[PDB]
Symmetry: D2
Subunit: 281 residues, 4 copies
Amino acid sequence: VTMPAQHQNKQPGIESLMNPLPQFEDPNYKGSEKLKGKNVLITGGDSGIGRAVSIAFAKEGANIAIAYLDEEGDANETKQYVEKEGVKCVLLPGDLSDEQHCKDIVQETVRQLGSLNILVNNVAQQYPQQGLEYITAEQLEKTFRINIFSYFHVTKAALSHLKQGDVIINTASIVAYEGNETLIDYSATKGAIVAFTRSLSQSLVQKGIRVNGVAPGPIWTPLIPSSFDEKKVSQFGSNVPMQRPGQPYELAPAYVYLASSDSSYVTGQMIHVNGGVIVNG
Amino acid sequence: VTMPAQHQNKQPGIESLMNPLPQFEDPNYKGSEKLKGKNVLITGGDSGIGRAVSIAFAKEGANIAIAYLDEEGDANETKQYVEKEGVKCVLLPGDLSDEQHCKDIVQETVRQLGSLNILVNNVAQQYPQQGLEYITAEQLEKTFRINIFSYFHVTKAALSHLKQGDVIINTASIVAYEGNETLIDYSATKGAIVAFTRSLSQSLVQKGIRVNGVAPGPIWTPLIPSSFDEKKVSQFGSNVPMQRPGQPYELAPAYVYLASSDSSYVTGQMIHVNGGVIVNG
Amino acid sequence: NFVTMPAQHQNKQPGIESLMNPLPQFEDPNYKGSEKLKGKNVLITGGDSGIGRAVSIAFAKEGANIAIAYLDEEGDANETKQYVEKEGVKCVLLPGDLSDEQHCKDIVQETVRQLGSLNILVNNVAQQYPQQGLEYITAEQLEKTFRINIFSYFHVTKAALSHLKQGDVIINTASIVAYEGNETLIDYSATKGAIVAFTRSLSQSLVQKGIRVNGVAPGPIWTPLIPSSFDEKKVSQFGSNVPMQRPGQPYELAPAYVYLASSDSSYVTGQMIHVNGGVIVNG
Amino acid sequence: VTMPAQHQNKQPGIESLMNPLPQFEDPNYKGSEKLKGKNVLITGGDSGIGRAVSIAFAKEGANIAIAYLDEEGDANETKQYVEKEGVKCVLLPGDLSDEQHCKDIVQETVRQLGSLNILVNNVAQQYPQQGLEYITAEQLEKTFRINIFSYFHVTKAALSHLKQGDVIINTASIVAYEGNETLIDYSATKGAIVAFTRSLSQSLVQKGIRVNGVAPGPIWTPLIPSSFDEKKVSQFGSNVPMQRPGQPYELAPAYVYLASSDSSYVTGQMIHVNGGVIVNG
Ligand SMILES: NC(=O)c1ccc[n+]([C@@H]2O[C@H](COP(=O)([O-])OP(=O)(O)OC[C@H]3O[C@@H](n4cnc5c(N)ncnc54)[C@H](O)[C@@H]3O)[C@@H](O)[C@H]2O)c1
Ligand SMILES: NC(=O)c1ccc[n+]([C@@H]2O[C@H](COP(=O)([O-])OP(=O)(O)OC[C@H]3O[C@@H](n4cnc5c(N)ncnc54)[C@H](O)[C@@H]3O)[C@@H](O)[C@H]2O)c1
Ligand SMILES: NC(=O)c1ccc[n+]([C@@H]2O[C@H](COP(=O)([O-])OP(=O)(O)OC[C@H]3O[C@@H](n4cnc5c(N)ncnc54)[C@H](O)[C@@H]3O)[C@@H](O)[C@H]2O)c1
Ligand SMILES: NC(=O)c1ccc[n+]([C@@H]2O[C@H](COP(=O)([O-])OP(=O)(O)OC[C@H]3O[C@@H](n4cnc5c(N)ncnc54)[C@H](O)[C@@H]3O)[C@@H](O)[C@H]2O)c1
Ligand SMILES: [Mg+2]
Ligand SMILES: [Mg+2]
Ligand SMILES: [Mg+2]
Ligand SMILES: [Mg+2]
């Protein structure tokens, strides 16, 4: 029993309802201008991993545009932490399962921030089921529409604003590599993201645009209590070698590494931040 | 230059119009009852790799149900090769982008053959584009609906008919592992298939149903001249270490291995038949 | 974990199959040969027992003549020889220590002499010495493990090259541990990772000469390497950890080798066939 | 052609003899106390990647013990850069192909620095040959003794001194994943390092010691002109998608990430810094 049994009825989950509250910030973390003056669009940056990435990026001197569905309280709080760092922050609520909106958040980021340098595709929804026979066509399509189609549409719109030295980071998952028997459709979307990352990296390498991914293991975020039942929530992260789930702040440095010139010779790759699970990486 | 320059105007391609005709049968291949009495459903079994698999399976004593879109001439020919081995063959035309049709082919297979033992998900369409900006939502969704959603729907319908000792094989692609800059959407669907394979193997292992895949490299099939330009077609397969594309007959024994009790201790895996491209396999 | 086999241990490695309970199953009674390797001449190191015995017998059933190299298990090599010859093919026994370079050369020369040529090489010998941690791995054990597990693959394969031609094949036995790691077999796993990279590199080296190079990565297989390396407790629960919740039998590995050794895998080189009870290795 | 044709008649190579000199430092690199007060032992830290790692670690506040064979000029030069950052630097020459020396460098590091927190195993030699027949047993054993046996011996001796929160990083290579036809023995040592990394991570996880690796692609270091011929040297790095070899400084931030608390949820992994080569990572 790593975490207290709990569950939220609607997804996307709300961070402010969780106990304990995910740690999205490392108090000892010191920014060093790794992304100074850079303009970022992070989808799903209002909470969980996205929140921790937004704040770390702001600490590194980046201006952050945060897209999210409707978690206004969570998004505002994230905006407070971001602006505390003295950079610009824009909130872009809306449903990214709609192509047009995927285009709109990109246009809006460029209008308010002035330009776009770094795109972090990170939104997701997950609907556990005991087997394939319990996955309806409706859930299948919905899961793909937000998990992978949004990555295509937002990235596609961002391409007319990206130039040499710019970067794309996609949040995938350990399940793309290891599979998950109770998240078959979700896993398929994550495998799709991994192949997307690989192919797009090769497509944009000569344009000087790098494309990489982060594959988290079990991280304590609103996705967990809003998708899994209480029993499972209580044992979350107990399966990995470190015997604990990760906290969102533990993911941020991977994104900072991939987003900055620190990884100038890196494209088409995945950073596995998963508590010790070996994936032939 | 490996093949003569040629291009077919519509996809799915027609095998009888190709020069040279793919070699779908190994003259020296000797069946040994590896699948005697087994009932098989293979989607996309009318031509290319599926055609070679259908025929090898028939030489191994299995009854074959073949689903395909509308290539009646190719399907008919495949049927004559299968029947020559003295087994049953059932042709199932129709559009597998429709969920109900996915369910119907499974029901029809059971009706005609009596039961279902081996499912081979193998249908695909691919639409090369010079970059992500040239992929419409229409193309993206179409590509996913046939390449991965059909694998989900057909397999889901098959589950109520599969029992201990039964088997699922999914055709993926080298592109899920290596990426392909001109087939970003298609590669994404193949990455989805890889993860699907891994998750489903874990879901069904205690039910005694194995699930594996085959990742071909460049194989001479109707998919090639129906998707790529005449120039690309003429050099097809010159990029791999063996410096030639594979022939469909060269894929069939991997499917035989995975379909039979020869691989009784194998599940969740991928067989790479690609002319020597190293994929950290 | 749970008990999958009777508790047992052999305080001598390489292990002896005739002492095991139950005897591993190295033959599928229902397996039907179909001349996939008719007239081929094979050299298999460690072909006297476990996986190697199963491969020898299956290859014989496919029409291949088998030269079997092993260390000192004459009882096992002879019994294997009986099974091979029962399939109506030739069998040559090649005892000796493959941790010695010259002997690696000699077994190749001998094979060509008695069989007349060499078409297929299966590098399969291995020793393993579990330790609870790296601090318990001596330099002695380290070098010994490498010398037999990977140096012999280099030396035997190297000697085989002047005899292999277009259409010939090399198969190397690796292990799931090269992919997943194994905390109690750190040096062994390092030798298996070395074999994976050797397989990949050599495949590219020989592709234009028409010689294919592939490997098989077994999971937990009930063979003499198990009771002779692990303690009784560990042996009793062997194979309980994998998704299929059981160890594999040696006969369950042979068809992968047949696939890789024959023309059935003509468009395959540089690859690994994972036969491990369902462990996902990002394969 | 990427570099000037050049070649050194002895290995390990000497960095001061190279044209152009490898860039081991990013002038705009800003340290942020990521490793403040940490005590590091780096084998092969005198030149190439190791030099860039030593210097970046010094900028992050770490004290550096540098082991190397006998390249005293290079080691002294690296020492000056390290000490410029106000941290301690210890030089430890000697042949790590000897087990006792491997133990001695660890004992010496602990004596000079007070403790050991981070071990970077990075030493290597490589002897290209046109084929397996051209690899003598002498070369094979030499290659393994330094490339992998030293990693075992040095790490083994370090275990007495490592506790919760400490870290091991091993330098592997892309060749372990992709293979290399002219570096068959070397590649096998690097494949050994990958498996070593994975197994040791699982062995040490409950002790709170993380173990990860870095797999570089073609990096311009003394190893290159000292092993490859002038023709090959001149075209070095032109094979990867970014169409250039990497510079040592582009490797340092990955080591910084893996060495610091920034990767607290990362063990058993590999960071691929290779100019865009996809390796199913
Ligand atoms: N254990 C884990 O948390 C875990 C493991 C592996 C991967 N991931 C990945 O982490 C990423 C971030 O998720 P998280 O765990 O931080 O949880 P999260 O709930 O905090 O973040 C997901 C975000 O996606 C956004 N979103 C969902 N549907 C949307 C829609 N229709 N339109 C616009 N935005 C929408 C929400 O605003 C939400 O905040 C996801 O891609 C997820 O797949 C998470
Ligand atoms: N170079 C290659 O040929 C190559 C490489 C990697 C993977 N593959 C895979 O091999 C598999 C078989 O393709 P192939 O190369 O043999 O070409 P193929 O054209 O011979 O087979 C593909 C089949 O898919 C079927 N299909 C397409 N759309 C359909 C739909 N709407 N409804 C029902 N059926 C439909 C067609 O009947 C067609 O015969 C595919 O999954 C493909 O992705 C091929
Ligand atoms: N669970 C498993 O059994 C398992 C798992 C993964 C990989 N493998 C691999 O399978 C292969 C065969 O092993 P097995 O499990 O069948 O056990 P096995 O003991 O039956 O076969 C190994 C053989 O290696 C030979 N050998 C050992 N030292 C030798 C030496 N010094 N000189 C010459 N020959 C020597 C012995 O003759 C022995 O018969 C090995 O490469 C092993 O690493 C086994
Ligand atoms: N293109 C590349 O440079 C490339 C590619 C992939 C991996 N790598 C890896 O990078 C690591 C660093 O090498 P590099 O390229 O920075 O070259 P380098 O020559 O600058 O560093 C290697 C160091 O190993 C040390 N060394 C060699 N033999 C020794 C011995 N017997 N005893 C003690 N020390 C010894 C030398 O002091 C030398 O400085 C190596 O592990 C190498 O395999 C390099
Ligand atoms: Mg949220
Ligand atoms: Mg067709
Ligand atoms: Mg034996
Ligand atoms: Mg040096």
